[PDB]
Design a protein around this ligand. Structure first.
Ligand SMILES: C[C@H](CS)C(=O)N1CCC(CC(=O)O)CC1
Ligand SMILES: [Zn+2]
Ligand SMILES: [Zn+2]
Length: 230
């Protein structure tokens, strides 16, 4: 429990079968930026949400899983086509892991400097993933909340836990800004943040890319800040 340093990465147990992975990249004007994703054990397999920033860091996530869990990684899903979430796709492919992203993330990946995932998720008009596109996802419940941080951003709840992951859409309850809005839909952000909250009403622990886990005040605060963009 608590933070475990493993090379240049940090791992933190959040629930009996859920860990947060954290990796860092220098960005001028922002410093060494943390990005979080998730590792979930579902019976005899492991599921990953988001890569680390780089292939080397992502291979270290797989090394941590080997050491600490020692079960095969059945699949990975990534939450949009920016480097913090998709930068390590080649490491997953080298390891033989099946990879999934929003169809739109895969379409955008080359222009964003990313390698596409192998499989494309599609979404119903109400935002829930079309189940045939997310086979064998076990407790991962994938939801497209609308355009926000990016047009392609997706979110993931973990069935059987109190955890939902907002990726880079959600910031914590004390954040001063919405971060990188360069690819954002400023008109729709607030609604998208609120739709994430409404999709996962029982999630009391909100995990996000660039803050430590928080309560649902992360959602309300993020949406209230995004009201300013309209
Ligand atoms: C590469 C990523 C893709 S979301 C990015 O653009 N940034 C990292 C996060 C910072 C905001 C922060 O430090 O919390 C903005 C810049
Ligand atoms: Zn992003
Ligand atoms: Zn990000």
């Amino acid at each position: 429990t608590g933070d475990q340093r493993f090379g240049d990465l940090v791992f933190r147990q959040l629930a009996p079968n859920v860990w947060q992975h954290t990796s860092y990249l220098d960005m001028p004007g922002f410093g060494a930026v943390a990005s979080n994703g998730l590792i979930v054990r579902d019976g005899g397999r492991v599921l990953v949400v988001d890569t680390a920033w780089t292939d080397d860091q992502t291979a270290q996530i797989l090394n941590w899983i080997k050491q600490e869990i020692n079960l095969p990684v059945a699949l990975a899903v990534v939450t949009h086509a920016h480097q913090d979430k998709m930068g390590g796709m080649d490491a997953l492919h080298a390891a033989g892991i099946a990879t999934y992203a929003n169809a739109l993330s895969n379409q955008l990946a080359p222009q964003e400097g990313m390698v596409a995932a192998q499989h494309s998720l599609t979404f119903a008009a109400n935002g829930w993933v079309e189940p045939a596109t997310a086979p064998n996802f076990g407790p991962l419940k994938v939801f497209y909340p609308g355009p926000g941080h990016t047009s392609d951003n997706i979110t993931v709840g973990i069935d059987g836990t109190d955890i939902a992951f907002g990726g880079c859409l959600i910031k914590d309850s004390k954040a001063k800004s919405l971060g990188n809005l360069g690819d954002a839909d400023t008109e729709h952000y607030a609604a998208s943040a609120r739709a994430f909250g409404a999709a996962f009403p029982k999630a009391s622990m909100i995990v996000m890319s660039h803050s430590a886990p928080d309560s649902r005040a992360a959602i309300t605060h993020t949406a209230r800040m995004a009201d300013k963009l309209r």
